[PDB]
Design a protein around this ligand. Sequence first.
Ligand SMILES: Cc1nc2ccccc2n1CCC(N)=O
Length: 119
Amino acid sequence: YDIQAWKKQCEELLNLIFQCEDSEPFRQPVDLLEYPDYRDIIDTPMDFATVRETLEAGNYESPMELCKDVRLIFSNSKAYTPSKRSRIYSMSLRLSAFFEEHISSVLSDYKSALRFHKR
Ligand SMILES: Cc1nc2ccccc2n1CCC(N)=O
């Protein structure tokens, strides 16, 4: 029932994500010199360094907000990919599966703790 436990749990999951080779295309903002039309397709860029910095600044109130930004990294990759078989998009799908598998208990524990707080 610890309402604050999600933050360190998210920090540890982000550390695992940064160790994953599949996260390399998503660690830093997409470079416009490499992908000149990126901002014609993607309105809201997101990357794992931005998520980590937002968490560390104390700018997430809940793990749901962090989850929304991580999911935006994956939806941006899906929207930008020229093919559903592209290398970077394929890496995004594996990384998304790994993230969803691990974030599930973080979200459940937070929501349960909050329900207990408001009982
Ligand atoms: C984030 C992303 N998703 C893509 C899907 C397909 C092709 C490129 C893609 N990028 C950019 C890779 C980078 N510039 O770091």
